[PDB]
Structure formats: structure tokens, C-alpha cells
Design a binder for this molecule. Structure first.
Ligand SMILES: [K+]
Ligand SMILES: [K+]
Ligand SMILES: [Mg+2]
Ligand SMILES: [Mg+2]
Ligand SMILES: [Mg+2]
Ligand SMILES: [Mg+2]
Ligand SMILES: [Mg+2]
Ligand SMILES: [Mg+2]
Ligand SMILES: [Mg+2]
Ligand SMILES: [Mg+2]
Ligand SMILES: [Mg+2]
Ligand SMILES: [Mg+2]
Ligand SMILES: [Mg+2]
Ligand SMILES: [Mg+2]
Ligand SMILES: [Mg+2]
Ligand SMILES: [Mg+2]
Lengths: 239, 118, 50
RNA sequence: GGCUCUCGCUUCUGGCGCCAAGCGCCCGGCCGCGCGCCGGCCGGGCGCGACCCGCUCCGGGGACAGUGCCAGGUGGGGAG
RNA sequence: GGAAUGGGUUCGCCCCGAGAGAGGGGCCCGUGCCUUGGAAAGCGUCGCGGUUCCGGCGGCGUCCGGUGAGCUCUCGCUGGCCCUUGAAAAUCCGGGGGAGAGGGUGUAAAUCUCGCGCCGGGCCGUACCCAUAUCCGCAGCAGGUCUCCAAGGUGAACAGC
RNA sequence: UUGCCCUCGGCCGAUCGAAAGGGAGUCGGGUUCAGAUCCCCGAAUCCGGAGCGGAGAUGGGCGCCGCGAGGCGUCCAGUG
């Protein structure tokens, strides 16, 4: 080993060697738009969120949602290019034989809050899935209650963008199942049973489940330190 | 992913250069101030005569737009001569007068004869 | 315009290799070349900041 | 080690102090190598060093102040 | 090197064991003098030409000292005054540091704030008055309008004469 | 040279604001009816850009040949 090599430790004490390049992410002066979206997320935790808005925090767990998308993938709306293929093919093929074959339009998902709202009111929707991040939330804040009243199972899922990918769009407030094929009837039934217990059967307590009203970590820590002081006094009284 | 500064700065973003689908002007503008516009007419005054005979320098009235580089370049291949120095003034009537001193080998009196000044 | 003298005091910067010059109100008795200490753990001396 | 409080490195001096030492990991190339273990050389990145987590930059106020709109008083400062 | 028997020193001060005096030296300024410029040019004087509207040609000279509380400018030194402390910036430079860079003994290499050489410096102003007649005051109006240079005598004196 | 990436960069405030403030570097002689530190003659200089010198830098060690001088090999230096 070379005897010229030696350790040269740096003392990072106050008044000592210059401080290192530490991660200052906690103390960065963020832009106003970054501060605005972060403080908004905190105000939702800090303020008392009424149950109608708060109920959208209860979303499906990971494995159910993955199972739900697996079935909903089988009933995705045809893309305009795919529909054009279907048409030319149908028009040319049915031209050779008999053109008049309406037959049956296969089942497919129904997207959009307006389309779903009418389906629920007519009791034509077997299962309604609503995104939890719709903004403005007025667009769907009535939907869980409406599905409960008409007795159709509804589940809140994480991500309007996730629903939008089903319908080949950027976002989607909600989707609905109306019909499924013969082989998917069992798969749909298992999901409806699980969802109905979580949301429809529980809707009495959902109506009163207020959210937010949680103070921030520093304030809660001061509160816990005062509680320890009050406990010391209780222990002295016991002694 | 470490931020070592307490200040957030605007990220550097790509700025593309212009690739227009049509030029805003159909054709480039013709150079109005050409060699003939730069030189208007030689001055043929007694004072300008002394400059030609003694100082080997020609006196011209030139466009006010023109500078010494343009005046030198204009005189150079209008009259096919070489120029050593150009001294310009703007006379009180608003014209620009250029004293164009030719190279020592060229003779101002000879050039004045070919121009027609004398 | 001010009846009180001011003191040019030079401190090292903690985070950057750079000297920071601070303009202080001169406490009577301080002199040039004197070290002055500022902090919670500074000592109780004329010119110190606590 | 059990339970608590405090502390984190700088105070004779008109000096210096940044752009990492050191340890650890991995990737290599090149040249030997005796076909076998690999070595030497030349480097590149990284973690530790510099602890982890967290929801408001830190601190002081604070449902007051303040502002908006009425209401009463004062108002030769000003208007007629 | 080491000072009291204190000494050095100014018009005044002021300085010294934190180093006086004394001896040796270093630095800055250098507007003065000599030199290259440089006498060829300028000027004085005596001549001779001419293209007589020539930067004409010649001769000789342009020398040696003194003085100063002089005056003006400039540069220093050293003080006094202030409850007054008397710009900023462009711009240029030195240092600390040492990441690098350079070639392996040569026909060396990086490199160079040394000497010389090469090329370029565009645009606008520039005449004249600046005042008992070129400005303002209706005018060539006894008014008004910011500055620099400043001889001899008398005398305290940019006083008056 | 070009695009990308890494690294570092407070531009702690656009811009304007003096023909008396700050601000590189031109002087002598001659010349016009009227110009002049601007023209002419002569002697310089500053700033900006890209050849020849000179510096860096040619030192020392040990063997060999040679009367010697000098050369040859080989190793070590060399930002005055
Ligand atoms: K009143
Ligand atoms: K100026
Ligand atoms: Mg001019
Ligand atoms: Mg009144
Ligand atoms: Mg003579
Ligand atoms: Mg004097
Ligand atoms: Mg150095
Ligand atoms: Mg003039
Ligand atoms: Mg008058
Ligand atoms: Mg007058
Ligand atoms: Mg008038
Ligand atoms: Mg006088
Ligand atoms: Mg007098
Ligand atoms: Mg300006
Ligand atoms: Mg000036
Ligand atoms: Mg004149």
C-alpha cells in the first residue's frame, strides 16, 4: 500500500468546514403552481370533508380493480378505425348474400356520466364503475347515491385516466356494464357480489363518514408531548 | 434526484428554429444603394481642384446612407482604381461629400480626365 | 445622518466558500480586528449577538 | 443495557478553509498468462462518508386584525 | 545595530526599544535635463534666383550666466475643520487556489503579460458669433447670459492710475 | 463544427439617464479667401484580430571509443 495515501476527514460542525451539498428538497422555494397543488392536498386532510365528497376516497383495492379491468378489457368500445374495418367488411360481405342482417349488436361498455346516469335511472346498468379523481367532483358526486337508490352495484376505482384508457380517451368519469357474454356472466357475478357488500350494502354508514379533520404531524407531536406530561401527573397521583 | 439548491429554476427546454411553410416576402429586396447610387456626381470646385492637383484626392458627392467602406468599394470598381483613404463630411445643405485619396501610383489628374471632371 | 458608528464585520459563509460582509451598529468598545461571535452559544461579551 | 434530562464537536492570535479524502460495490478495456489460475496496467460510475421518516420553507401572529357593505358619532381639513 | 548625559527634527510639527540617530541599500514619480526624434524643420538676419501665386536657393546665427517669501500651473509633504466624513458603475489589474495541460531527451512539447512583423478601426458632430452688433429681452436695446489664458511701472495687491 | 447529455453559473433585476462626472489611445511643422490635434509632410500610439525570432530548454550520472578534445549507448532531471 502506498504510504502517501491518507484519510482527510471533514468536520461538518458549526463554524467548521463548509457544509456538503445536502438534499434540500424539503426547503426548496417551489413555484406558485407547485405550492398551490400541494397546499390543496393538505387542506383536504386538514378540513372536514363532507361524506358525499369523502366517499370517493374509498376506492377498490388493488387486486379487485385489476380483476375489474380484466373483465372490462373484453368490452372496450370499438376504435373509429376498427369500426370502419367492421363496416367495409360487413357491407361487402353482406352485399354478396342478403344485406338485411341487423343480427345482434354485441355488448360493450357504456362511457360518460350522462350515458351512465340514464342507464342507472332505467335500471339498465348491471355494474357502474366511477373514477375517484373527477374534477369538478359535482359531475359524479350524486352518482353513488343514485346507484344505491336504483339498486345497481357501484364501485369507485382509482384513476379517471385508467378508465379513459378503456375507452381510448384521455379520461372518463365513469363506465357501466349492461350486458356481458355467456362466459362472462359468472365472472361479472363474482365482482358484483364483492362490490355490493363494499358499497351498496354499506351505504348507510358511507352517508355519514366524514373525512379529513386530521391535524399536521408537528401539531399532533406537540399534542402527544403534552399528553405524556399529563400522564406523568396521573402516575404521580397514583404513587 | 437530489436538489442541492433552495431555488427552483425554469428547466431548459428545446427551442426549435423556424421552418416556415412560406416566405413572408416572395423575393429579396433589390439593393437600392448600389455603386451608381452611392456616387452621385464629382465635385468640380476650385477647392476640389486643389485636392485633385495637390493631394491626389478626388471629391465626390455621395449618398448620405453610404459609409466609408461603401464609398471606397464603389469608387474602386466604378473607375477601376485603388483607393488609399476616404474622408467624409456632411455639408450644411445635407449632402455627403467624400474626399477619396487614391493610391500613390494612380494619378488623380489622369483619373479626372477620364471621368470628365476637367 | 447617523450619530452612531457602524461596524463592517466579515463572517465566513456556512454553505459556500465566500466571505459575507455585514454592517452592524457599533457597540461602544469594539475595535477593528476584534472577533465578534453571534449565536445561541456565543459568550456574553461586548459586541456579541445572543 | 432498563427509565428520563442534556449534548453533537468552531472562543489566547486582524492566517487557511469550496470544487472529498478514505472505505466499500460493480462495470470494464489493454497487456502478459499457459492454456492455467489469474495478475499487472489504465480507467468509468456508484453507495458510505453527510442517519431514517414526515403534510404545510422557517418563525411570529390568527378567526382576531383587515377588507367589503350598512349604522351612529366626530369632522371649517375640505365643498357649497 | 541598539539609543538617558535622551536624541533626531519642522515654518508648525512630529518621531523613536512596537527600534531613534548613524552607515549601506530597495521602491515610486520623473511634467525637468541630455539623447533618438533633431535640424532636414522653425525663427532671426544678410544676400541670390525664379515657373515672379516656388513648402525657392544660399550665408551666418539661434549663445553664456545669475536671482527669487515674485506671480500662475503642477506635484508632493504635513496638519486643521465636521452632531457636515465629502458618488456609482462600466472597465482594467494583482494575488490565493491547483482541476488540468504538456513531452520523455528531441528537428523536443504544451506554453509565453519579451522583441519584431501583418491586417482593420464603421456612424454622427466639426464653418462662424459667443456679445455695449451673430444668443434672450419685438431692435445692432446702457438689461441678462456658464468658463480658460493674463505683461511692465507704482503699490499690500488680478485696487486705482 | 453540430445536436444531445452531464457539470457549473445569485447575472439578487429589462432599459434609459452627463458634448462639465468615470472613460484606452496624437503630436510637431506646413498649408486655405474661408478647414484642420481632422488636410499634407514627418514622427508615434491605443485597441481588435490571425508570421519570424526569443523564452520554456536542453542539465547531470555511468560505461565505451579517442593522445586529448569530442562522439556513442543508457538512465535520471528540467512549467526560468
Ligand atoms: K370642516
Ligand atoms: K461624458
Ligand atoms: Mg467626421
Ligand atoms: Mg367655508
Ligand atoms: Mg536651419
Ligand atoms: Mg508650488
Ligand atoms: Mg500559483
Ligand atoms: Mg472651430
Ligand atoms: Mg446689449
Ligand atoms: Mg452686458
Ligand atoms: Mg420672443
Ligand atoms: Mg495680473
Ligand atoms: Mg494693478
Ligand atoms: Mg446609456
Ligand atoms: Mg467627461
Ligand atoms: Mg478657423
Amino acid at each position: 500500500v502506498n504510504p502517501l495515501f491518507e484519510k482527510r476527514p471533514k468536520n461538518f460542525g458549526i463554524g467548521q468546514d463548509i457544509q456538503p451539498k445536502r438534499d434540500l428538497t424539503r426547503f426548496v422555494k417551489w413555484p406558485r403552481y407547485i405550492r398551490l397543488q400541494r397546499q390543496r392536498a393538505i387542506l383536504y386532510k386538514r378540513l372536514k370533508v363532507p361524506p358525499a365528497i369523502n366517499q370517493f376516497t374509498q376506492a377498490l383495492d388493488r387486486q379487485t380493480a385489476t380483476q375489474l379491468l380484466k373483465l372490462a378489457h373484453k368490452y372496450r368500445p370499438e376504435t373509429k378505425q376498427e369500426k370502419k374495418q367492421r363496416l367495409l367488411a360487413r357491407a361487402e360481405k353482406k352485399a354478396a348474400g342478403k344485406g338485411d342482417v341487423p343480427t345482434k349488436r354485441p355488448p360493450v361498455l357504456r362511457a360518460g356520466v350522462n350515458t351512465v346516469t340514464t342507464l342507472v335511472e332505467n335500471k339498465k346498468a348491471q355494474l357502474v364503475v366511477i373514477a375517484h379523481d373527477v374534477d369538478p367532483i359535482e359531475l359524479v358526486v350524486f352518482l353513488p347515491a343514485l346507484c344505491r337508490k336504483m339498486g345497481v352495484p357501484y364501485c369507485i376505482i382509482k384513476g379517471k385516466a385508467r378508465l379513459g384508457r378503456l375507452v381510448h380517451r384521455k379520461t372518463c368519469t365513469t363506465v357501466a356494464f349492461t350486458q356481458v357474454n355467456s362466459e362472462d356472466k359468472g365472472a361479472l357475478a363474482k365482482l358484483v357480489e364483492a362490490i355490493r357488500t363494499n358499497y351498496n350494502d354499506r351505504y348507510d354508514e358511507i352517508r355519514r363518514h366524514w373525512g379529513g379533520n386530521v391535524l399536521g404531524p408537528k401539531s399532533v407531536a406537540r399534542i402527544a408531548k403534552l399528553e405524556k406530561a399529563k400522564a406523568k401527573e396521573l402516575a404521580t397521583k397514583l404513587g | 434526484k437530489i436538489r442541492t439548491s433552495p431555488t427552483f429554476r425554469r428547466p431548459k427546454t428545446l427551442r426549435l428554429r423556424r421552418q416556415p411553410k412560406y416566405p413572408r416576402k416572395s423575393a429579396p429586396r433589390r439593393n437600392k444603394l448600389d455603386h451608381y447610387a452611392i456616387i452621385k456626381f464629382p465635385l468640380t470646385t476650385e477647392s476640389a481642384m486643389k485636392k485633385i492637383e495637390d493631394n491626389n484626392t478626388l471629391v465626390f458627392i455621395v449618398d448620405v446612407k453610404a459609409n466609408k467602406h461603401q464609398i471606397k468599394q464603389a469608387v474602386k470598381k466604378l473607375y477601376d482604381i485603388d483607393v488609399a483613404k476616404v474622408n467624409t463630411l456632411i455639408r450644411p445643405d445635407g449632402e455627403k461629400k467624400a474626399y477619396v485619396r487614391l493610391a500613390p501610383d494612380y494619378d488623380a489628374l489622369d483619373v479626372a480626365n477620364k471621368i470628365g471632371i476637367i | 445622518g447617523r450619530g452612531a458608528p457602524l461596524a463592517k464585520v466579515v463572517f465566513r459563509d456556512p454553505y459556500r466558500f465566500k466571505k459575507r460582509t455585514e454592517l452592524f451598529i457599533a457597540a461602544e468598545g469594539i475595535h477593528t480586528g476584534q472577533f465578534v461571535y453571534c449565536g445561541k452559544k456565543a459568550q456574553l461579551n461586548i459586541g456579541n449577538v445572543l
